[PDB]
Design a binder for this molecule. Sequence first.
Ligand SMILES: Nc1ncnc2c1ncn2[C@@H]1O[C@H](COP(=O)(O)OP(=O)(O)OP(=O)(O)O)[C@@H](O)[C@H]1O
Ligand SMILES: Nc1ncnc2c1ncn2[C@@H]1O[C@H](COP(=O)(O)OP(=O)(O)OP(=O)(O)O)[C@@H](O)[C@H]1O
Ligand SMILES: Nc1ncnc2c1ncn2[C@@H]1O[C@H](COP(=O)(O)OP(=O)(O)OP(=O)(O)O)[C@@H](O)[C@H]1O
Ligand SMILES: Nc1ncnc2c1ncn2[C@@H]1O[C@H](COP(=O)(O)OP(=O)(O)OP(=O)(O)O)[C@@H](O)[C@H]1O
Lengths: 311, 311, 311, 311
Amino acid sequence: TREARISRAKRAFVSTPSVRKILSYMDRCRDLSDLESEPTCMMVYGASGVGKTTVIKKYLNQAAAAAAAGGDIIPVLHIELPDNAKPVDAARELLVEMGDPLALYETDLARLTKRLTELIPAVGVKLIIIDEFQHLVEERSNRVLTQVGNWLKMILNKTKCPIVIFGMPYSKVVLQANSQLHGRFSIQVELRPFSYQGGRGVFKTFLEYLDKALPFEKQAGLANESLQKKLYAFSQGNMRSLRNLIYQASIEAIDNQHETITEEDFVFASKLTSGDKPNSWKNPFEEGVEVTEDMLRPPPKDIGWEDYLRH
Amino acid sequence: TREARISRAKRAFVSTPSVRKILSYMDRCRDLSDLESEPTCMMVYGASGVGKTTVIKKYLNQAAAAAAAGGDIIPVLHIELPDNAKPVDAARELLVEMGDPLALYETDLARLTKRLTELIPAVGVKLIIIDEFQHLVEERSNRVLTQVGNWLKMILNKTKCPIVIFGMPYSKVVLQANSQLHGRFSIQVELRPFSYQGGRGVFKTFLEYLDKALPFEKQAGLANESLQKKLYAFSQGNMRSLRNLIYQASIEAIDNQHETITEEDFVFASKLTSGDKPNSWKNPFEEGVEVTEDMLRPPPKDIGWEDYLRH
Amino acid sequence: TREARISRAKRAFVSTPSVRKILSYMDRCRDLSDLESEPTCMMVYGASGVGKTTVIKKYLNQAAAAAAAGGDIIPVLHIELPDNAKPVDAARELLVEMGDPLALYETDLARLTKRLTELIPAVGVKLIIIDEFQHLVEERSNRVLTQVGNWLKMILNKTKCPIVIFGMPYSKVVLQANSQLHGRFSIQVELRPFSYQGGRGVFKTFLEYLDKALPFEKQAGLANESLQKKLYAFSQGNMRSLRNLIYQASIEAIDNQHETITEEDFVFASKLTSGDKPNSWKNPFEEGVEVTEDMLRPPPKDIGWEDYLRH
Amino acid sequence: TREARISRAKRAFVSTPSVRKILSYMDRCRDLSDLESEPTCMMVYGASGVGKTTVIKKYLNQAAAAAAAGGDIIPVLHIELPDNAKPVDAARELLVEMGDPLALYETDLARLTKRLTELIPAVGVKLIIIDEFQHLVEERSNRVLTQVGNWLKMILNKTKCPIVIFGMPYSKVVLQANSQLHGRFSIQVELRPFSYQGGRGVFKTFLEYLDKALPFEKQAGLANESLQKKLYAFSQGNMRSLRNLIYQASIEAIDNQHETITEEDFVFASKLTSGDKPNSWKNPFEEGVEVTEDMLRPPPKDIGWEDYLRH
Ligand SMILES: Nc1ncnc2c1ncn2[C@@H]1O[C@H](COP(=O)(O)OP(=O)(O)OP(=O)(O)O)[C@@H](O)[C@H]1O
Ligand SMILES: Nc1ncnc2c1ncn2[C@@H]1O[C@H](COP(=O)(O)OP(=O)(O)OP(=O)(O)O)[C@@H](O)[C@H]1O
Ligand SMILES: Nc1ncnc2c1ncn2[C@@H]1O[C@H](COP(=O)(O)OP(=O)(O)OP(=O)(O)O)[C@@H](O)[C@H]1O
Ligand SMILES: Nc1ncnc2c1ncn2[C@@H]1O[C@H](COP(=O)(O)OP(=O)(O)OP(=O)(O)O)[C@@H](O)[C@H]1O
């Protein structure tokens, strides 16, 4: 098995230009906010499985590895909002995250704000990052709760720490609720999936950078004339499912004697990870499924919005 | 009576290839998830009485017998979700299950998440398995609650422990609620009942492996030309009712002098366990009921879905 | 009695060349229509009791037995139009027939067309067959309603599924109503009854194939020099009455000790099934009725048209 | 069989100059209407089976293939009016056609006009095309309903989108009902069938372009001195029946060993598709039928008007 090759095949990262555009903007946000005056407050979108958490873990690596190895400073922070977040609920988890506090046996929402606003200059927080903004909409109706939104405006105007919010593409109507939240968050971006399969894409260079990143030491055989056809036939532009199927083929090749990912084990990888796909999506690998041109069609605009049509 | 023969007739297990396919996939999931990076998160389906609980008890036997006899490690865990599960309700029972905690006199849902995420690396949990996913749909309407779903995504992204969910076939629309839950659960399988009676089935080999597994030391007389006809006439493909009727015949044969299951006591076993069957299902054993070809017809696709049509 | 012999005497089928000509044309229509472009849309005629329903049940046997035993595909469909069919009335019964829908508590005729045109590629309908086209003419006048005709053109041009219409010979003036229906239905055939008695007919071979098909294991005595004379004297060319009288003799022979259909029990069969015949038709079997040559005269052209003269 | 040759023999298109005259006029109508001021509103006629639907599918190919592959724009639209169209009935189907709406559970005819007039600039409709205008006349009487006509004038004057109406030649009296509809539709054309067989016709070049379009790789033998005689004897000028008989011969030649359509299999094609023809039409192919000069007579003016004489 040689589990080093397995973990080294799973932990692989390809920097598409949108990702480095993002990380450049967050360093821009980090040492552009001067902690004297009003911050910049970027907002990042992206659908399910487009690489968001990988982006922020890249960011806390390249921004906080040496400063977390040096001492208890914690300049950048990483937060997910729990579902249907009460303002005291999000505030207390954001508080027990940073520092070494006890911090949550009292739930009073004024005095823990006191403790968090005295601690946010005490350890020297350079940036606060929130992962999951779509948790503030109701399940069965599309009312949105902005107790946490006005609380986040309060902690923004209290201490001038920059905030970078990630979230689903349907989570922006929450920002359409509070207009002061809408104006305070100026930079919204678009981390949409891979666009086309027609040729000379960013998809190409991503694919062959992943190919040299793979643990097989000669060639992976991928990013070819017909392979990206069935690859884009399998995953829409969907980064998580593409990488998942690729990893599930790579483990199958390293289970036995195999020199590269080839045409006997990539099929069984299509057999496993075909579960999340819809019924009208077509299964292209086993016996005779040639792929029409309409099925490599680019992803629509409401690609991170199908959590929202039904209600 | 000789109760050893009774318990040894009840506890009998036949490994059909779908079961070993499952258990191979869960060892694949166990030492494929590296506990560094993102897990694999299999999902298992199956209707009522298709052998699910027997599969997981086989699994905790073959995976945790020696490690539970060695010390307090508890690498694999077994959980059922209680009905209409609150997120704190499922979390506290999942917490009192593992370790030796007190764990449930406080119901605060942030600090018990704290305790569970510090304990899930402390004892070294290799796998968490949930039995009953269909308990998250409402009785009278088909609203589904995904407080527990977003909480399970939270505990998935917090600590990278693999999760194997079992459940009813109509319970997958719950996974259709949250698209991030849908994408995070890639491997969905199909544990459907026995398909046909026409000949050269998996049903055959299952039947005669059960026949050699029976406590009668010469031959059970089953898996014959006409016996599987009335067997598939009694149980649809339904593993629980087939095994139940077989056990109820075996006890009747060992109650008195009988050398094998035969044509006087298998009838009284059809007399007892005919209660759960529908009205239009035909009762084939007593006096003259010859079985038409249409009544050995394979089970439909909505065979684990008749909890769902009426509302 | 031995009811196997009774059902095996009733369910007997003789393939005259017009029937196999038909079934060849409907397989021609099935895999000639490519479901990309414009279909072929055969029309079949035939008077009362000429074997139409038996032909289509033969067809769904030989075309859909294995595919209906395999799963829920339903490639070929079987429809009768109810009398004075409203377009929503025919559409809703054609809808509840295929698939497993609820489908008829709403009667809106635009949204059920929506459901039927999304379902006709969803299950993969290869062919739609309609039995009763003569139900679209008014009783007391010969106005014909073509709401259903233009609706059938609409569903024909919407999805390109081939349609095979059966019906009475006077039902073709309905197709003379809409000229686009007239041009879209190109292949009209003629399933007329048996032509003559005079010798070397198709009637001969049909008769002795029925004779070997009968449950009597030596000879039926039929298709002889004088027996087909009184047979064609009884039934005009009328398949239903000929087969009905033959079956009513065969049951009378198997009621008691009889070795073949003979000249004591075939008479009582003429006594029973002489009711539907006209007054000027002559009753030839009992005491002395020798049959003239003019009474074996071939059937006229308006043999499926006597529902139409009076108004 | 080689189904590629079958579909490639069915999908063949010959551009007679009237068709390219039409398509030139609809591009003229598309980018002559400026969407600022009053549109041009062409009207197209033609009898049954003269190639209308093929013309518009050619048009949406050559006008909307790349723009439908690019994104959700849908510049040109394709509509058939259902039979006896209510204004809300035609409006709701024209609405669910374009865009991705729900659109038809409310039938209120003022608010769906609101939605359609805000959506017709939202997606950027360049052209609306209606197939079936003859559905607005009553069956049994020649009253015509112009609720849909005044509604179409309303949507024409509301947003200035050009409209191209196809329809039967007897459907123009509907346009004679509303004089404002009559004046708003200026360009009416004449897509009549093929005129003569006497020599040097457009029929000639059409016939040999179809001959080189056929799947037989040497010569089809057609468009000769005597073959177009019996061809025009079979089909009047009728494009659908001519192409249908030609296709039914081509399949018969490719069923067995045959090198071209010849004089044994073209006859059986005349045997099949002779059903839609009238009684006084003469059947010319089998044994000795030489064709008089009067039977190649040009089609009359009321050739798309025989749906209209009887009432
Ligand atoms: N740049 C990249 N190069 C290689 N693999 C990547 C890259 N980005 C993402 N992936 C893969 O995609 C998978 C999904 O990552 P991630 O969870 O960050 O997406 P996401 O949009 O955050 O999904 P979710 O929002 O549901 O958490 C990861 O397992 C990772 O291996
Ligand atoms: N492989 C097998 N060999 C022999 N017997 C089996 C096998 N699988 C299941 N059974 C029998 O079927 C019965 C039902 O088992 P089980 O409860 O696991 O099914 P289930 O689908 O989990 O039902 P439920 O979901 O309602 O608990 C058991 O009593 C067991 O004896
Ligand atoms: N080929 C055949 N061989 C033997 N019997 C036949 C054959 N065709 C028809 N019959 C007999 O004729 C009887 C009438 O059949 P059927 O109802 O199909 O005729 P039909 O024209 O459809 O009458 P209707 O239109 O009134 O239903 C059947 O009971 C059947 O037994
Ligand atoms: N230019 C052409 N070249 C070759 N074949 C053609 C051409 N035009 C039409 N056809 C053939 O004629 C047949 C009838 O086409 P179409 O339905 O468009 O006529 P139509 O007048 O629209 O009939 P309807 O109005 O009843 O739909 C088609 O199957 C097509 O194959």
